[PDB]
Nucleic acid binder design. Structure first.
Ligand SMILES: [K+]
Ligand SMILES: [K+]
Ligand SMILES: [Mg+2]
Ligand SMILES: [Mg+2]
Ligand SMILES: [Mg+2]
Ligand SMILES: [Mg+2]
Ligand SMILES: [Mg+2]
Ligand SMILES: [Mg+2]
Ligand SMILES: [Mg+2]
Ligand SMILES: [Mg+2]
Ligand SMILES: [Mg+2]
Ligand SMILES: [Mg+2]
Ligand SMILES: [Mg+2]
Ligand SMILES: [Mg+2]
Ligand SMILES: [Mg+2]
Ligand SMILES: [Mg+2]
Ligand SMILES: [Mg+2]
Ligand SMILES: [Mg+2]
Ligand SMILES: [Mg+2]
Ligand SMILES: [Mg+2]
Ligand SMILES: [Mg+2]
Ligand SMILES: [Mg+2]
Ligand SMILES: [Mg+2]
Ligand SMILES: [Mg+2]
Ligand SMILES: [Mg+2]
Ligand SMILES: [Mg+2]
Ligand SMILES: [Mg+2]
Ligand SMILES: [Mg+2]
Ligand SMILES: [Mg+2]
Ligand SMILES: [Mg+2]
Ligand SMILES: [Zn+2]
Lengths: 53, 142, 101, 47, 154, 116, 110
RNA sequence: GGUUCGUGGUAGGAGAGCGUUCUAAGGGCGGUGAAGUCAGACCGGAAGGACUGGUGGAGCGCUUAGAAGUGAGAAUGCCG
RNA sequence: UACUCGGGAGUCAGACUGCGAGUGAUAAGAUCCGUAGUCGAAAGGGAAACAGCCCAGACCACCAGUUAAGGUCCCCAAAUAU
RNA sequence: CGAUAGUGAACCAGUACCGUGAGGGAAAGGUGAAAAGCACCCCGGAAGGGGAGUGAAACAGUUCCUGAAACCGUGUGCCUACAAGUAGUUAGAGCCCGUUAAUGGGUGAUAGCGUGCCUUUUGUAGAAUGAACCGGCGAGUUACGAUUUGUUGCAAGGUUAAG
C-alpha cells in the first residue's frame, strides 16, 4: 500500500507510452476546404451536408 | 595483444548426419554438444557459434542400458499446483524420441542465448529419413 | 617468413617491418636489439627449436621508450574501511623488426 | 623571511583525528568501539 | 556556541512519536542557524624566548647583514627641515634603492618626518632595533652614535 | 579563520561521476551510487586482470586440442611429447599456428609424436 | 530562416501541455492549428497563440511564406512553481504545486 | 647506487605527504580577460595538479615559513 | 630474536573444525575447559551455491611457465587413460 | 565572519507567523559606470514574445553579477521486443567519430565472472540498522596545569612573575 521503491525514469516513461492522445478525426470541409470534424457541423461556414445552419 | 577471434560467418559450418542406432543416449549427446559448440575446430571462439549443424536419425533405436527404459523418469511441471507430469525414457524412445534427444542435449549445451541458438541447429528423426537432403550432409562417426 | 622469439618473460610472433611493444629494454632510440632466443621459424621452411634454433637471431630497431596509459588500481574491503589506491604505467619499448637471420 | 626554515624536529604537524580512514585516526578516532572510554568526557578518575 | 546563540530551551518535538530525529534545541550545531562547536575564542599568542636567545638573535641578524654587505654606516644624519626630497636624494647618494631601516641616536631632528612618507623605509631610535624589524627590511643604515649605543647595550 | 567548504567537494565528486560514465541511470549522475559503482568496477577490474590470463590459457588449450585431435593426438600427449622433445613454445603461439599455420602446427605435432 | 515564439510563465502544468505538443511537432501549420482547435484541452489555445505568433513574426520579420511552414520544434520547459497547501485532516497540511510552463514553438519552411 | 630478507590486514600504534581559508615576505599574471563554472582522450605512486577551449567579467596564483572554524556519504542529521 | 626502561593504544560478546575430558541422552550449529588450526582482521583455487572444511598467503603490470587441493564425456580446462 | 556565515535581525525584525497568555520566532542581499529602464512595428484581450533600438553586453530587461547538481525536456550517433540477473567488469565483433596522439574515443550483439555502501556483529547481499535524491552547514577544540619525546639557548646552574 506504499511504494517499496521509487519508480525510475525509465519505468515511469514506459508507463507513459500510452497516456498520449490521438490526432482528431478531422478533415477539410467540402464547402470551405477548412479542417473540421467528421459528422460534425463546420464552425467556420456553419454548414453541414451541403446545408447551412 | 593479438590472438584470433572468429566472426559470425567467418567459418564454414557443415551439416552432419549420425546413425543413433545402439549408441547410448549420453555418449551420442556428448559428442553432438561439442560439435555444436565448435570444439573440434581450432577457430573456436567462446562467444561465437563456429559450430556445425547436426542431424540424428534412428533415434528410436537409441541405447539405454540398465532399467532406464522403466526407471529413468522425465518430469515436467506446468507451474500449477500438482501440475507434475512424469514419463519414462523408454516410452519416450517409443513415441517421441526426438524430444528425448532434445532433452538430453539441451542439458549438455550451455544455458545461454547462444546455447538456445545452438539447439536450433539440431534436427532429430526416429526414422532413417530426413528433410535436409537439400543441404547435402556428410556422415559423422563417433 | 616469421619467427617466434622470447622477450620479457614471454614469446611473440614476429615478422619484418612489424611494430612491436615489449617490456623495457636497456636501449636508446635508433639503437639495435638482437634477440637470440628464437624458438621457431616458419615460411618456405620449418626449423624447430630444442628449445632454441642454433645461431638464429632477430634484429630490431628501438623506436620509442615509453610508459603506457595510466592504469588506476583500487582495492577495497567492505565494512572494514580498507581502501587502497595506486597508479601504474607499465614501461614499454617499441621496436621495428628489420630482418630475421 | 621568504627563506625561513626552522630547526628539524622542533615542529611537527598536529594529528587530526576523525578525518578519514586512510589517516588511521578516522571513524572511532582512536577510542575503539562502545564503552565508557569512547564517550565525550569518558573515562574515570585517575585512581 | 549553542549556549550563546539566541534561543533554544524548547525541545522542538517529543523524544518519541513524531518520526523526526530526536532533537533538543533549535540552536544545536547541526542546525542551520545554530551554534558553533568549539571554534575560536580570544587568545594571546604572545610567547617570549629567553633573553639570551634573543640577544643572540639580534647579534646574529646584524652579523648576517655585515656578511651580506648591507650595512651602511655614516658619520651623521641630519636635516635642516623635514624634506623627503632631501632624504630620498641621500638614498641615491648612497645606492640603497631597496627597503631599508635607518637607526639614529644623534640630534636627528627631522629625519623621521622626512622618511615617514616613503613606504620601503623605516626609522627607529636605536633602542628599538628588533630582529623582526630588521629582517623585515633589506638594508640597515646605522649612524655612528647609534652603533656605539647598540654596542654598549650589547 | 573560517574555511567554507568550497569547490573541492564538487571537484572530487564530479571526477567520480565522470568515471561513472556509461552506466544505467542514476549511476552516471549521482555521487552516492556512482562512487560505489566506481569502486566495484575497480575491484572487478583488479580481479579480472587475473581471471583474464586464465581465460586466455583456457582458450589456447582448447584450440590446440581441437587442432591436435585432427592429427590423432590429444592435448595431453602433445604437451608431453613437446616437453620430451624439449621445445618450450607456449600455448599462445601454438594456437596462433593452429589457426593460421596449421602446416607448422602439424610439423611440431609430428616431432612430438616422434619423441613419444 | 527559422522563427519562434515563447509563452513564458504560463500557468498550465508542463505535462498537461506536452501531452498536446506531441501531436504538433513535425507538421504543417494549417494542420497544427486545426489540431489545436479541435483537440479539447486546456493547453490548446495557449499553444495556438504561440504558434500563430511564430507564424506572424516569420511573416513580418523574416519575410517567409506561411504556406510552406512546418513546426520545426516545439517543446515545454518547466517554469517556477507557486507553492500552496490544501488543509488536510488531523491538523496537518499537504503541499500543492501550482506548476507553470515555458511553451516554445519554432517554425521554418520545409 | 648495491646485496639479503620482505611488501593481506580489522581495532590500534608510527611516519611521510595532498589539499582548503588566512597572514608576512619575496617574486609574479590579469580586461590582449582574474577567481569561478562547463567540457575534454594530459600529468603524478595516492590524496591531487596542469593545459586547451567555451561562459564569465575583477581579482588571483607560485615559493618558503606560520596559524587554523581544515577535507562528509550516512547522525529516523539541520535548512533549501 | 629475546629482556629492560619509557611514550601511546585497543581488547576483557569470540565462532567453527580436528584431538583429549566434563555437563548433556557417549543429542544439539548446545554448553564449558585444554590443545592446534582457520575465520575474526584473508583475498585466491576447490567443496553447486558455502566466514568458520581442503589446498594455499594478493605491492603493481604481462593475451608467459610449472604446480597444490580437486579433477580430465558435456555443461567446464584437461584421459571417453593404461 | 562575509549573506545556511556573522548579531535572531546586512533587506522597515523582535517584524511576519504561532500562542488565551507569559512566551517562542523566521525567511528574505547584488541590473547597469550611468535608467541610458526596450520609442516604433508584428502576434496577442492581457501576460509573454519576435524584430528594431539603448548600452561594452539584454543568454544584464525590474530575484536583474556569476548561475553547480538533483530535476524536467527537445534532437540525434550506437544498441534493444526468445529475454530475466546489485546492472558492472574482462574478452569482443559490427557500426560511428577523430583526441591534451596514445598501444585513441562512444556504442555496445554475444561470452566468462560477479549477492550495494555504512553501521554493528562470532558472523550481515542480508528477510538486522540508516539514508529518496542533490546542494550547502555539520563532530577531539581552547585556557590553565602534570608527564614524556624532539629542538634550541645557558649549564651546577637555569629562569624571571606582577610591574
Ligand atoms: K562540506
Ligand atoms: K575560465
Ligand atoms: Mg600527522
Ligand atoms: Mg598517530
Ligand atoms: Mg587502522
Ligand atoms: Mg565512515
Ligand atoms: Mg560506534
Ligand atoms: Mg563491546
Ligand atoms: Mg573500549
Ligand atoms: Mg539556554
Ligand atoms: Mg596460469
Ligand atoms: Mg481543523
Ligand atoms: Mg600493509
Ligand atoms: Mg569543519
Ligand atoms: Mg556454539
Ligand atoms: Mg575446541
Ligand atoms: Mg569485531
Ligand atoms: Mg578464502
Ligand atoms: Mg566458486
Ligand atoms: Mg564478511
Ligand atoms: Mg604477501
Ligand atoms: Mg602443467
Ligand atoms: Mg573440454
Ligand atoms: Mg550567495
Ligand atoms: Mg543570517
Ligand atoms: Mg541571473
Ligand atoms: Mg532478439
Ligand atoms: Mg530485499
Ligand atoms: Mg530506511
Ligand atoms: Mg545531503
Ligand atoms: Zn466548412
Amino acid at each position: 500500500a506504499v511504494p517499496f521503491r521509487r519508480t525510475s525514469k525509465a519505468k515511469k516513461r514506459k508507463r507513459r507510452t500510452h497516456v498520449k492522445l490521438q490526432l482528431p478525426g478531422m478533415n477539410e470541409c467540402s464547402n470551405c476546404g477548412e479542417y473540421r470534424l467528421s459528422h460534425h457541423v463546420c464552425p467556420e461556414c456553419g454548414q453541414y451536408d451541403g446545408k447551412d445552419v | 595483444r593479438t590472438t584470433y577471434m572468429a566472426k559470425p560467418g567467418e567459418v564454414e559450418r557443415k551439416w552432419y548426419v549420425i546413425d543413433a542406432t545402439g549408441v547410448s543416449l549420453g555418449r551420442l549427446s556428448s559428442e553432438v554438444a561439442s560439435i555444436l559448440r565448435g570444439k573440434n575446430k581450432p577457430q573456436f571462439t567462446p562467444h561465437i557459434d563456429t559450430g556445425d549443424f547436426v542431424i540424428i536419425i534412428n533415434a528410436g533405436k537409441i541405447g539405454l542400458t540398465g532399467k532406464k527404459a522403466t526407471d529413468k523418469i522425465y518430469y515436467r511441471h506446468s507451474q500449477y499446483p500438482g501440475g507434475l507430469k512424469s514419463r519414462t525414457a523408454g516410452e519416450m524412445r517409443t513415441n517421441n524420441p526426438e524430444k528425448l534427444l532434445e532433452l538430453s542435449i539441451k542439458g549438455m549445451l550451455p544455458k545461454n542465448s547462444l546455447g538456445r541458438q545452438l539447439f536450433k541447429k539440431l534436427h532429430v528423426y526416429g526414422g532413417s529419413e530426413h528433410e535436409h537432403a537439400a543441404q547435402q550432409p556428410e556422415v559423422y562417426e563417433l | 617468413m616469421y619467427a617466434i622469439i622470447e622477450t620479457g618473460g614471454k614469446q611473440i610472433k614476429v615478422e619484418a617491418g612489424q611494430e612491436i611493444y615489449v617490456e623495457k629494454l636497456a636501449g636508446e632510440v635508433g639503437d639495435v636489439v638482437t634477440f637470440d632466443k628464437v624458438l621457431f621459424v616458419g615460411g618456405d621452411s620449418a626449423k624447430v627449436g630444442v628449445p632454441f634454433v642454433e645461431g638464429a637471431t632477430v634484429t630490431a630497431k628501438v623506436e620509442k621508450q615509453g610508459r603506457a596509459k595510466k592504469l588506476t588500481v583500487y582495492k577495497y574491503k567492505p565494512k572494514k574501511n580498507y581502501h587502497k589506491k595506486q597508479g601504474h604505467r607499465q614501461p614499454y619499448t617499441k621496436l621495428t623488426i628489420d630482418a630475421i637471420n | 623571511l621568504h627563506e625561513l626554515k626552522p630547526s628539524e624536529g622542533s615542529r611537527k604537524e598536529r594529528n587530526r583525528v576523525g578525518r578519514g580512514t586512510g589517516s588511521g585516526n578516522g571513524k572511532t578516532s582512536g577510542r575503539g568501539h562502545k564503552g565508557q572510554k569512547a564517550r565525550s568526557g569518558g573515562g574515570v578518575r585517575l585512581g | 556556541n549553542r549556549s550563546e546563540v539566541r534561543g533554544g530551551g524548547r525541545k522542538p518535538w517529543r523524544q518519541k512519536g513524531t518520526g523526526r530525529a530526536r532533537q533538543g534545541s533549535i540552536r544545536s550545531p547541526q542546525w542551520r542557524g545554530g551554534g558553533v562547536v568549539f571554534g575560536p575564542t580570544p587568545r594571546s599568542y604572545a610567547y617570549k624566548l629567553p633573553k639570551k636567545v634573543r640577544r643572540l638573535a639580534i647579534k646574529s641578524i646584524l652579523s648576517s647583514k655585515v656578511n651580506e654587505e648591507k650595512l651602511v654606516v655614516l658619520e651623521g644624519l641630519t636635516f635642516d627641515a623635514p624634506k623627503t626630497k632631501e632624504f630620498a636624494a641621500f638614498l641615491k647618494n648612497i645606492s640603497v634603492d631597496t627597503k631599508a631601516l635607518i637607526v639614529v641616536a644623534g640630534e636627528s631632528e627631522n629625519v623621521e618626518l622626512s622618511a615617514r612618507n616613503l613606504q620601503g623605509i623605516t626609522v627607529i631610535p636605536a633602542e628599538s632595533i628588533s630582529v623582526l624589524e630588521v629582517a623585515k627590511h633589506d638594508k640597515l643604515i646605522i649612524t655612528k652614535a647609534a652603533v656605539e649605543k647598540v654596542e654598549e647595550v650589547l | 579563520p573560517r574555511v567554507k567548504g568550497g569547490t573541492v567537494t564538487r571537484k572530487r565528486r564530479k571526477k567520480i561521476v565522470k568515471l561513472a560514465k556509461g552506466y544505467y541511470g542514476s549511476k552516471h549522475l549521482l555521487f552516492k551510487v556512482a562512487n560505489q559503482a566506481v569502486m566495484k568496477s575497480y575491484q572487478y577490474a583488479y580481479r579480472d586482470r587475473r581471471q583474464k590470463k586464465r581465460d586466455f590459457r583456457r582458450l589456447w588449450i582448447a584450440r590446440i586440442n581441437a587442432a591436435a585431435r585432427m592429427q590423432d593426438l590429444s592435448y595431453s600427449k602433445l604437451m608431453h611429447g613437446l616437453k620430451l622433445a624439449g621445445i618450450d613454445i607456449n600455448r599462445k603461439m601454438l594456437a596462433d599456428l593452429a589457426v593460421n599455420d596449421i602446416a607448422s602446427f602439424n610439423t611440431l605435432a609430428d616431432s612430438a609424436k616422434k619423441a613419444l | 530562416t527559422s522563427a519562434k515564439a515563447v509563452a513564458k510563465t504560463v500557468r498550465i502544468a508542463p505535462r498537461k501541455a506536452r501531452i498536446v505538443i506531441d501531436l504538433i511537432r513535425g507538421k504543417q501549420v494549417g494542420e497544427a492549428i486545426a489540431i489545436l482547435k479541435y483537440t479539447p484541452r486546456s493547453a490548446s489555445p495557449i499553444i495556438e497563440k504561440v504558434l500563430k505568433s511564430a507564424i506572424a513574426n516569420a511573416e513580418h520579420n523574416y519575410d517567409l511564406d506561411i504556406n510552406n511552414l512546418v513546426v520545426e520544434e516545439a517543446f515545454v520547459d518547466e517554469g517556477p512553481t507557486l507553492k500552496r497547501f490544501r488543509p488536510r485532516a488531523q491538523g496537518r497540511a499537504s503541499a500543492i504545486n501550482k506548476r507553470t510552463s515555458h511553451i516554445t514553438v519554432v517554425v521554418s519552411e520545409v
